[PDB]
JSON list of C-alpha atoms in Angstrom, two decimals:
[
{"chain": "A", "resi": 1, "resn": "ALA", "atom": "CA", "xyz": [35.16, 9.78, -5.88]},
{"chain": "A", "resi": 2, "resn": "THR", "atom": "CA", "xyz": [34.83, 8.60, -2.30]},
{"chain": "A", "resi": 3, "resn": "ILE", "atom": "CA", "xyz": [31.96, 6.14, -1.96]},
{"chain": "A", "resi": 4, "resn": "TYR", "atom": "CA", "xyz": [29.91, 6.29, 1.30]},
{"chain": "A", "resi": 5, "resn": "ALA", "atom": "CA", "xyz": [27.97, 3.29, 2.57]},
{"chain": "A", "resi": 6, "resn": "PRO", "atom": "CA", "xyz": [26.06, 3.68, 5.78]},
{"chain": "A", "resi": 7, "resn": "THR", "atom": "CA", "xyz": [25.22, 0.69, 7.92]},
{"chain": "A", "resi": 8, "resn": "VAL", "atom": "CA", "xyz": [21.74, 0.72, 9.30]},
{"chain": "A", "resi": 9, "resn": "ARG", "atom": "CA", "xyz": [20.87, -1.81, 11.96]},
{"chain": "A", "resi": 10, "resn": "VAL", "atom": "CA", "xyz": [17.40, -1.18, 13.47]},
{"chain": "A", "resi": 11, "resn": "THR", "atom": "CA", "xyz": [16.85, -2.26, 17.04]},
{"chain": "A", "resi": 12, "resn": "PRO", "atom": "CA", "xyz": [13.55, -4.14, 17.52]},
{"chain": "A", "resi": 13, "resn": "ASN", "atom": "CA", "xyz": [11.19, -2.39, 19.93]},
{"chain": "A", "resi": 14, "resn": "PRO", "atom": "CA", "xyz": [9.55, -4.53, 22.66]},
{"chain": "A", "resi": 15, "resn": "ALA", "atom": "CA", "xyz": [6.30, -2.70, 22.22]},
{"chain": "A", "resi": 16, "resn": "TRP", "atom": "CA", "xyz": [5.84, -3.43, 18.54]},
{"chain": "A", "resi": 17, "resn": "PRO", "atom": "CA", "xyz": [3.04, -5.94, 17.98]},
{"chain": "A", "resi": 18, "resn": "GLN", "atom": "CA", "xyz": [4.07, -9.36, 16.72]},
{"chain": "A", "resi": 19, "resn": "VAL", "atom": "CA", "xyz": [1.83, -9.69, 13.67]},
{"chain": "A", "resi": 20, "resn": "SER", "atom": "CA", "xyz": [0.81, -12.35, 11.15]},
{"chain": "A", "resi": 21, "resn": "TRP", "atom": "CA", "xyz": [-0.35, -10.31, 8.12]},
{"chain": "A", "resi": 22, "resn": "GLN", "atom": "CA", "xyz": [2.05, -9.96, 5.20]},
{"chain": "A", "resi": 23, "resn": "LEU", "atom": "CA", "xyz": [3.86, -6.91, 3.98]},
{"chain": "A", "resi": 24, "resn": "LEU", "atom": "CA", "xyz": [4.89, -5.80, 0.57]},
{"chain": "A", "resi": 25, "resn": "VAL", "atom": "CA", "xyz": [7.41, -2.93, 0.64]},
{"chain": "A", "resi": 26, "resn": "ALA", "atom": "CA", "xyz": [7.11, -0.95, -2.60]},
{"chain": "A", "resi": 27, "resn": "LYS", "atom": "CA", "xyz": [9.95, 0.86, -4.42]},
{"chain": "A", "resi": 28, "resn": "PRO", "atom": "CA", "xyz": [10.17, 4.36, -2.88]},
{"chain": "A", "resi": 29, "resn": "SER", "atom": "CA", "xyz": [9.39, 7.08, -5.34]},
{"chain": "A", "resi": 30, "resn": "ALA", "atom": "CA", "xyz": [11.31, 10.36, -5.75]},
{"chain": "A", "resi": 31, "resn": "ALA", "atom": "CA", "xyz": [12.61, 13.08, -8.07]},
{"chain": "A", "resi": 32, "resn": "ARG", "atom": "CA", "xyz": [15.66, 12.02, -10.14]},
{"chain": "A", "resi": 33, "resn": "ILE", "atom": "CA", "xyz": [17.84, 14.33, -8.08]},
{"chain": "A", "resi": 34, "resn": "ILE", "atom": "CA", "xyz": [17.14, 12.28, -4.88]},
{"chain": "A", "resi": 35, "resn": "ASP", "atom": "CA", "xyz": [17.15, 9.00, -6.72]},
{"chain": "A", "resi": 36, "resn": "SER", "atom": "CA", "xyz": [20.75, 9.31, -7.80]},
{"chain": "A", "resi": 37, "resn": "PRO", "atom": "CA", "xyz": [23.88, 7.98, -6.10]},
{"chain": "A", "resi": 38, "resn": "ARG", "atom": "CA", "xyz": [24.85, 11.65, -5.71]},
{"chain": "A", "resi": 39, "resn": "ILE", "atom": "CA", "xyz": [24.69, 13.44, -2.40]},
{"chain": "A", "resi": 40, "resn": "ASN", "atom": "CA", "xyz": [22.50, 16.49, -2.23]},
{"chain": "A", "resi": 41, "resn": "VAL", "atom": "CA", "xyz": [23.42, 19.59, -0.33]},
{"chain": "A", "resi": 42, "resn": "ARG", "atom": "CA", "xyz": [21.41, 22.79, 0.16]},
{"chain": "A", "resi": 43, "resn": "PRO", "atom": "CA", "xyz": [24.04, 25.42, 1.00]},
{"chain": "A", "resi": 44, "resn": "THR", "atom": "CA", "xyz": [21.33, 28.15, 0.98]},
{"chain": "A", "resi": 45, "resn": "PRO", "atom": "CA", "xyz": [17.61, 27.75, 1.32]},
{"chain": "A", "resi": 46, "resn": "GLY", "atom": "CA", "xyz": [16.34, 28.02, -2.29]},
{"chain": "A", "resi": 47, "resn": "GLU", "atom": "CA", "xyz": [19.16, 25.96, -3.83]},
{"chain": "A", "resi": 48, "resn": "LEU", "atom": "CA", "xyz": [20.56, 22.45, -4.44]},
{"chain": "A", "resi": 49, "resn": "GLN", "atom": "CA", "xyz": [24.17, 21.40, -5.22]},
{"chain": "A", "resi": 50, "resn": "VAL", "atom": "CA", "xyz": [25.94, 17.98, -5.00]},
{"chain": "A", "resi": 51, "resn": "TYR", "atom": "CA", "xyz": [29.07, 17.25, -3.00]},
{"chain": "A", "resi": 52, "resn": "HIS", "atom": "CA", "xyz": [31.89, 16.89, -5.50]},
{"chain": "A", "resi": 53, "resn": "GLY", "atom": "CA", "xyz": [34.00, 13.73, -5.27]},
{"chain": "A", "resi": 54, "resn": "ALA", "atom": "CA", "xyz": [31.55, 12.02, -2.93]},
{"chain": "A", "resi": 55, "resn": "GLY", "atom": "CA", "xyz": [28.66, 9.63, -3.68]},
{"chain": "A", "resi": 56, "resn": "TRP", "atom": "CA", "xyz": [26.44, 6.87, -2.25]},
{"chain": "A", "resi": 57, "resn": "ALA", "atom": "CA", "xyz": [27.01, 3.06, -2.83]},
{"chain": "A", "resi": 58, "resn": "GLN", "atom": "CA", "xyz": [23.31, 2.79, -3.82]},
{"chain": "A", "resi": 59, "resn": "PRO", "atom": "CA", "xyz": [20.84, 5.45, -4.90]},
{"chain": "A", "resi": 60, "resn": "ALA", "atom": "CA", "xyz": [19.09, 7.01, -1.92]},
{"chain": "A", "resi": 61, "resn": "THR", "atom": "CA", "xyz": [15.71, 5.37, -2.52]},
{"chain": "A", "resi": 62, "resn": "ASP", "atom": "CA", "xyz": [17.45, 1.98, -2.63]},
{"chain": "A", "resi": 63, "resn": "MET", "atom": "CA", "xyz": [19.35, 2.64, 0.69]},
{"chain": "A", "resi": 64, "resn": "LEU", "atom": "CA", "xyz": [15.90, 3.46, 2.01]},
{"chain": "A", "resi": 65, "resn": "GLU", "atom": "CA", "xyz": [14.26, 0.42, 0.42]},
{"chain": "A", "resi": 66, "resn": "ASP", "atom": "CA", "xyz": [16.98, -1.82, 1.89]},
{"chain": "A", "resi": 67, "resn": "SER", "atom": "CA", "xyz": [16.89, -0.28, 5.37]},
{"chain": "A", "resi": 68, "resn": "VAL", "atom": "CA", "xyz": [13.19, -0.63, 5.66]},
{"chain": "A", "resi": 69, "resn": "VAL", "atom": "CA", "xyz": [12.97, -4.24, 4.47]},
{"chain": "A", "resi": 70, "resn": "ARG", "atom": "CA", "xyz": [16.03, -5.29, 6.44]},
{"chain": "A", "resi": 71, "resn": "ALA", "atom": "CA", "xyz": [14.62, -3.66, 9.59]},
{"chain": "A", "resi": 72, "resn": "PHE", "atom": "CA", "xyz": [11.32, -5.58, 9.14]},
{"chain": "A", "resi": 73, "resn": "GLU", "atom": "CA", "xyz": [13.37, -8.76, 8.61]},
{"chain": "A", "resi": 74, "resn": "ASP", "atom": "CA", "xyz": [15.53, -8.22, 11.66]},
{"chain": "A", "resi": 75, "resn": "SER", "atom": "CA", "xyz": [12.68, -7.22, 13.95]},
{"chain": "A", "resi": 76, "resn": "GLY", "atom": "CA", "xyz": [11.23, -10.61, 14.79]},
{"chain": "A", "resi": 77, "resn": "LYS", "atom": "CA", "xyz": [7.81, -8.95, 14.59]},
{"chain": "A", "resi": 78, "resn": "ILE", "atom": "CA", "xyz": [6.76, -9.96, 11.06]},
{"chain": "A", "resi": 79, "resn": "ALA", "atom": "CA", "xyz": [7.45, -13.22, 9.27]},
{"chain": "A", "resi": 80, "resn": "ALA", "atom": "CA", "xyz": [6.44, -12.02, 5.81]},
{"chain": "A", "resi": 81, "resn": "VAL", "atom": "CA", "xyz": [8.03, -8.96, 4.21]},
{"chain": "A", "resi": 82, "resn": "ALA", "atom": "CA", "xyz": [8.87, -8.82, 0.57]},
{"chain": "A", "resi": 83, "resn": "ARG", "atom": "CA", "xyz": [9.80, -6.54, -2.33]},
{"chain": "A", "resi": 84, "resn": "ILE", "atom": "CA", "xyz": [8.71, -7.12, -5.91]},
{"chain": "A", "resi": 85, "resn": "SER", "atom": "CA", "xyz": [0.39, -10.01, 0.57]},
{"chain": "A", "resi": 86, "resn": "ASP", "atom": "CA", "xyz": [-2.17, -8.26, 2.94]},
{"chain": "A", "resi": 87, "resn": "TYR", "atom": "CA", "xyz": [-0.65, -4.72, 3.20]},
{"chain": "A", "resi": 88, "resn": "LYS", "atom": "CA", "xyz": [1.53, -2.58, 0.93]},
{"chain": "A", "resi": 89, "resn": "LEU", "atom": "CA", "xyz": [3.98, 0.05, 2.32]},
{"chain": "A", "resi": 90, "resn": "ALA", "atom": "CA", "xyz": [4.52, 2.86, -0.16]},
{"chain": "A", "resi": 91, "resn": "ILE", "atom": "CA", "xyz": [7.12, 5.58, 0.51]},
{"chain": "A", "resi": 92, "resn": "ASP", "atom": "CA", "xyz": [7.48, 8.86, -1.36]},
{"chain": "A", "resi": 93, "resn": "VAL", "atom": "CA", "xyz": [10.84, 10.55, -0.57]},
{"chain": "A", "resi": 94, "resn": "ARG", "atom": "CA", "xyz": [10.67, 14.38, -0.47]},
{"chain": "A", "resi": 95, "resn": "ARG", "atom": "CA", "xyz": [14.08, 15.44, 0.81]},
{"chain": "A", "resi": 96, "resn": "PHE", "atom": "CA", "xyz": [17.34, 13.52, 1.03]},
{"chain": "A", "resi": 97, "resn": "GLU", "atom": "CA", "xyz": [19.94, 16.21, 1.61]},
{"chain": "A", "resi": 98, "resn": "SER", "atom": "CA", "xyz": [22.68, 17.81, 3.64]},
{"chain": "A", "resi": 99, "resn": "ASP", "atom": "CA", "xyz": [20.85, 20.94, 4.82]},
{"chain": "A", "resi": 100, "resn": "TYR", "atom": "CA", "xyz": [22.78, 23.94, 6.11]},
{"chain": "A", "resi": 101, "resn": "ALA", "atom": "CA", "xyz": [19.54, 25.66, 7.19]},
{"chain": "A", "resi": 102, "resn": "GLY", "atom": "CA", "xyz": [21.40, 29.02, 7.67]},
{"chain": "A", "resi": 103, "resn": "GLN", "atom": "CA", "xyz": [23.74, 27.35, 10.17]},
{"chain": "A", "resi": 104, "resn": "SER", "atom": "CA", "xyz": [27.44, 26.88, 10.16]},
{"chain": "A", "resi": 105, "resn": "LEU", "atom": "CA", "xyz": [27.18, 23.05, 10.05]},
{"chain": "A", "resi": 106, "resn": "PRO", "atom": "CA", "xyz": [24.54, 21.21, 7.99]},
{"chain": "A", "resi": 107, "resn": "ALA", "atom": "CA", "xyz": [21.97, 18.60, 9.05]},
{"chain": "A", "resi": 108, "resn": "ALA", "atom": "CA", "xyz": [21.47, 15.30, 7.21]},
{"chain": "A", "resi": 109, "resn": "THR", "atom": "CA", "xyz": [17.81, 15.54, 6.42]},
{"chain": "A", "resi": 110, "resn": "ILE", "atom": "CA", "xyz": [15.31, 12.97, 5.28]},
{"chain": "A", "resi": 111, "resn": "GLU", "atom": "CA", "xyz": [11.72, 13.89, 4.70]},
{"chain": "A", "resi": 112, "resn": "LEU", "atom": "CA", "xyz": [9.31, 11.24, 3.38]},
{"chain": "A", "resi": 113, "resn": "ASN", "atom": "CA", "xyz": [5.62, 10.16, 3.27]},
{"chain": "A", "resi": 114, "resn": "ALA", "atom": "CA", "xyz": [4.42, 6.59, 3.85]},
{"chain": "A", "resi": 115, "resn": "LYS", "atom": "CA", "xyz": [1.08, 5.24, 2.89]},
{"chain": "A", "resi": 116, "resn": "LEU", "atom": "CA", "xyz": [-0.05, 1.90, 4.15]},
{"chain": "A", "resi": 117, "resn": "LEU", "atom": "CA", "xyz": [-2.61, 0.34, 1.79]},
{"chain": "A", "resi": 118, "resn": "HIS", "atom": "CA", "xyz": [-4.80, -2.71, 2.25]},
{"chain": "A", "resi": 119, "resn": "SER", "atom": "CA", "xyz": [-3.95, -4.66, -0.94]},
{"chain": "A", "resi": 120, "resn": "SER", "atom": "CA", "xyz": [-7.56, -5.88, -1.48]},
{"chain": "A", "resi": 121, "resn": "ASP", "atom": "CA", "xyz": [-9.64, -2.71, -1.61]},
{"chain": "A", "resi": 122, "resn": "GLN", "atom": "CA", "xyz": [-6.69, -0.52, -2.64]},
{"chain": "A", "resi": 123, "resn": "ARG", "atom": "CA", "xyz": [-7.78, 1.11, 0.60]},
{"chain": "A", "resi": 124, "resn": "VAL", "atom": "CA", "xyz": [-5.69, 3.75, 2.27]},
{"chain": "A", "resi": 125, "resn": "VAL", "atom": "CA", "xyz": [-5.27, 2.62, 5.85]},
{"chain": "A", "resi": 126, "resn": "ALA", "atom": "CA", "xyz": [-3.26, 5.71, 6.88]},
{"chain": "A", "resi": 127, "resn": "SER", "atom": "CA", "xyz": [-0.58, 8.09, 5.76]},
{"chain": "A", "resi": 128, "resn": "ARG", "atom": "CA", "xyz": [2.13, 9.93, 7.65]},
{"chain": "A", "resi": 129, "resn": "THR", "atom": "CA", "xyz": [4.94, 12.37, 6.97]},
{"chain": "A", "resi": 130, "resn": "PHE", "atom": "CA", "xyz": [8.23, 11.62, 8.75]},
{"chain": "A", "resi": 131, "resn": "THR", "atom": "CA", "xyz": [10.99, 14.26, 8.93]},
{"chain": "A", "resi": 132, "resn": "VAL", "atom": "CA", "xyz": [14.33, 13.60, 10.52]},
{"chain": "A", "resi": 133, "resn": "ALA", "atom": "CA", "xyz": [17.30, 16.03, 10.73]},
{"chain": "A", "resi": 134, "resn": "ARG", "atom": "CA", "xyz": [20.55, 15.11, 12.45]},
{"chain": "A", "resi": 135, "resn": "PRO", "atom": "CA", "xyz": [23.33, 17.69, 12.88]},
{"chain": "A", "resi": 136, "resn": "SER", "atom": "CA", "xyz": [26.64, 16.75, 11.36]},
{"chain": "A", "resi": 137, "resn": "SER", "atom": "CA", "xyz": [29.76, 17.45, 13.37]},
{"chain": "A", "resi": 138, "resn": "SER", "atom": "CA", "xyz": [31.88, 19.00, 10.63]},
{"chain": "A", "resi": 139, "resn": "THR", "atom": "CA", "xyz": [31.46, 20.06, 6.99]},
{"chain": "A", "resi": 140, "resn": "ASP", "atom": "CA", "xyz": [33.59, 17.18, 5.51]},
{"chain": "A", "resi": 141, "resn": "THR", "atom": "CA", "xyz": [31.52, 14.70, 3.52]},
{"chain": "A", "resi": 142, "resn": "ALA", "atom": "CA", "xyz": [32.58, 11.90, 5.96]},
{"chain": "A", "resi": 143, "resn": "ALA", "atom": "CA", "xyz": [30.89, 13.77, 8.84]},
{"chain": "A", "resi": 144, "resn": "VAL", "atom": "CA", "xyz": [27.84, 14.30, 6.62]},
{"chain": "A", "resi": 145, "resn": "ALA", "atom": "CA", "xyz": [27.58, 10.61, 5.75]},
{"chain": "A", "resi": 146, "resn": "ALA", "atom": "CA", "xyz": [27.86, 9.70, 9.41]},
{"chain": "A", "resi": 147, "resn": "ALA", "atom": "CA", "xyz": [24.92, 12.01, 10.11]},
{"chain": "A", "resi": 148, "resn": "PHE", "atom": "CA", "xyz": [23.00, 10.35, 7.27]},
{"chain": "A", "resi": 149, "resn": "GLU", "atom": "CA", "xyz": [23.47, 6.96, 8.92]},
{"chain": "A", "resi": 150, "resn": "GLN", "atom": "CA", "xyz": [21.92, 8.45, 12.06]},
{"chain": "A", "resi": 151, "resn": "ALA", "atom": "CA", "xyz": [18.97, 9.96, 10.06]},
{"chain": "A", "resi": 152, "resn": "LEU", "atom": "CA", "xyz": [18.47, 6.77, 8.10]},
{"chain": "A", "resi": 153, "resn": "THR", "atom": "CA", "xyz": [18.48, 4.70, 11.26]},
{"chain": "A", "resi": 154, "resn": "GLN", "atom": "CA", "xyz": [16.01, 7.02, 13.03]},
{"chain": "A", "resi": 155, "resn": "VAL", "atom": "CA", "xyz": [13.47, 7.39, 10.12]},
{"chain": "A", "resi": 156, "resn": "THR", "atom": "CA", "xyz": [13.53, 3.63, 9.40]},
{"chain": "A", "resi": 157, "resn": "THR", "atom": "CA", "xyz": [12.85, 2.98, 13.12]},
{"chain": "A", "resi": 158, "resn": "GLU", "atom": "CA", "xyz": [9.88, 5.31, 12.98]},
{"chain": "A", "resi": 159, "resn": "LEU", "atom": "CA", "xyz": [8.60, 3.68, 9.79]},
{"chain": "A", "resi": 160, "resn": "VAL", "atom": "CA", "xyz": [8.81, 0.12, 10.87]},
{"chain": "A", "resi": 161, "resn": "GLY", "atom": "CA", "xyz": [7.06, 0.82, 14.17]},
{"chain": "A", "resi": 162, "resn": "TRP", "atom": "CA", "xyz": [4.32, 2.82, 12.56]},
{"chain": "A", "resi": 163, "resn": "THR", "atom": "CA", "xyz": [3.76, 0.18, 9.90]},
{"chain": "A", "resi": 164, "resn": "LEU", "atom": "CA", "xyz": [3.42, -2.63, 12.42]},
{"chain": "A", "resi": 165, "resn": "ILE", "atom": "CA", "xyz": [1.18, -0.66, 14.78]},
{"chain": "A", "resi": 166, "resn": "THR", "atom": "CA", "xyz": [-1.02, 0.92, 12.11]},
{"chain": "A", "resi": 167, "resn": "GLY", "atom": "CA", "xyz": [-1.21, -2.37, 10.21]},
{"chain": "A", "resi": 168, "resn": "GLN", "atom": "CA", "xyz": [-2.20, -4.24, 13.33]},
{"chain": "A", "resi": 169, "resn": "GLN", "atom": "CA", "xyz": [-4.89, -1.76, 14.41]},
{"chain": "A", "resi": 170, "resn": "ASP", "atom": "CA", "xyz": [-6.40, -2.04, 10.95]},
{"chain": "A", "resi": 171, "resn": "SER", "atom": "CA", "xyz": [-6.15, -5.81, 10.88]},
{"chain": "A", "resi": 172, "resn": "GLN", "atom": "CA", "xyz": [-8.20, -6.09, 14.07]},
{"chain": "A", "resi": 173, "resn": "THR", "atom": "CA", "xyz": [-11.30, -4.53, 12.41]}
]
């Protein structure tokens, strides 16, 4: 089995507020099929398979849990991020798959929902669905994994920025 391990470095955005509240990143939740080290593929729309002889170094929720927390760490925008505090970031992962979408070449696809909660009231600050699809350049699993690095990097960038901004607009009230 070839083992893929994407490298996700998230570039800090100059327009993200520098904050001083504290962030707990929860374990992402997901169906067992996503939360495996196996790599999902949807060769036709109603159907899931796994690439044979390919897998992920970590389960997909953990790659996602590490990207998110590492990107908060590396941002310079927030001094306090932790795993298992003022806010809690909870992610539910809906799709983590190589999606052919009736095309010749598939798209690495991540769809997920984040809630930001205010730890005190167990108060939903906001919620948002993020979908990212990045076309792969061939059908070999190596091309697919490369696309997944791109999708991971892009969704994590959208998460971090939305967490900081949403958190900060809530904190100011």
